[PDB]
């Protein structure tokens, strides 16, 4: 008995995975069907046809778009994340056909899953949205607007979102790909959203990703250097806290990118703060600040402006 062609089996397998769950029997059937379909689209060409696009997006929405540490049926959900990634990354993938089903409502529901407590799920969501942003040109502006709103609600309202760091990782690759002169909206996003993110109590959870976005902005356009540095000194822990190691880490990564033209404009308030870190009661804060002297580029920057920096770093040596 001929068991129908390959495209029909693909559609039926996708619809089997829409029946949400002999409990161990049917869960194993869907797990085998997902792994079977993963291998199908990975090692075959011309298998993602037009009727496949709605079946795949529907199966993903039925399994993933739900009401929300680790997941219960995660080995089942991981296969759906993996199949959908191979779906987006396949050479047969045509965004002109998929945009009828991967739209603003799909993206909006995908972003709400970033609040998941499962780090493995947030990592699959991070990569999924990264592929969607890169391949759907008509959704790029909408995706950044929603990320901007998520960050805004995280700063000035109920300040908790379990995926702030994952969203910053996506933005980092977006900022790294910005074009010739920056759009004015990008500079507004840096000075009014990315910089206020340094005040939140849980900064250490996402500080390495936030610091990468800040140095990528200054690496694109060096004009933002003064308002960026002055904001860091504003949000700097005025109390003697071990959190200053993060700021000292971010400040040196800026100095490895800073231009001599902009460095003169903020050097005095910078090293005045840096001098107080050397005098900190916390050994780790002073240890990190003293490590600046090993940076040959900072040394050259201080040498070309030795008349005003050295009196600050050594107040007893001068006069």
């Amino acid at each position: 008995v001929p068991p129908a062609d390959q495209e029909k089996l693909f559609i039926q397998k996708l619809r089997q995975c829409c029946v949400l769950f002999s409990d161990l029997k049917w869960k194993e059937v869907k797990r085998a069907a997902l792994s079977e379909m993963v291998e199908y689209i990975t090692h075959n060409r011309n298998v993602i046809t037009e009727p496949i696009y709605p079946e795949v997006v529907h199966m993903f929405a039925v399994n993933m778009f739900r009401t929300l540490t680790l997941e219960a049926a995660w080995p089942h959900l991981q296969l759906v994340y993996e199949f959908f990634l191979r779906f987006l990354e396949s050479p047969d993938f045509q965004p002109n056909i998929a945009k009828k089903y991967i739209d603003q409502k799909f993206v909006l529901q995908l972003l709400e899953l970033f609040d998941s407590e499962d780090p493995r799920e947030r990592d699959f969501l991070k990569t999924t949205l990264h592929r969607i942003y890169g391949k759907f040109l008509g959704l790029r502006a909408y995706i950044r607007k929603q990320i901007n709103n998520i960050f805004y609600r995280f700063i000035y309202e109920t300040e908790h979102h379990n995926g702030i760091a994952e969203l910053l990782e996506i933005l980092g690759s977006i900022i790294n790909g910005f074009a010739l002169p920056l759009k004015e909206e990008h500079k507004i996003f840096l000075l009014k959203v990315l910089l206020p993110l340094h005040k939140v109590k849980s900064l250490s959870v996402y500080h390495p990703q936030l610091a990468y976005c800040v140095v990528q902005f200054l690496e694109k356009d060096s004009t933002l250097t003064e308002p960026v540095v002055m904001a860091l000194l504003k949000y700097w822990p005025k109390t003697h806290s071990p959190k200053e190691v993060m700021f000292l880490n971010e400040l040196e990564e800026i100095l490895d990118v800073i231009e001599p033209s902009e460095f003169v404009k903020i050097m005095e308030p910078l090293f005045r703060q840096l001098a107080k870190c050397v005098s900190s009661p916390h050994f780790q804060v002073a240890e990190r600040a003293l490590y600046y002297w090993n940076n040959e580029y900072i040394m050259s920057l201080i040498s070309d402006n030795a008349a005003k920096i050295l009196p600050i770093m050594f107040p007893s040596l001068y006069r």
Binding site: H130, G134, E169, S173, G177
Partner: peptide, 14 residues
């Protein structure tokens, strides 16, 4: 850069 993801070039229209 450790956690850096592949960059996405701003070569589209908005």
């Amino acid at each position: 850069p450790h956690f850096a993801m592949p960059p996405i070039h701003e070569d589209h229209l908005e």
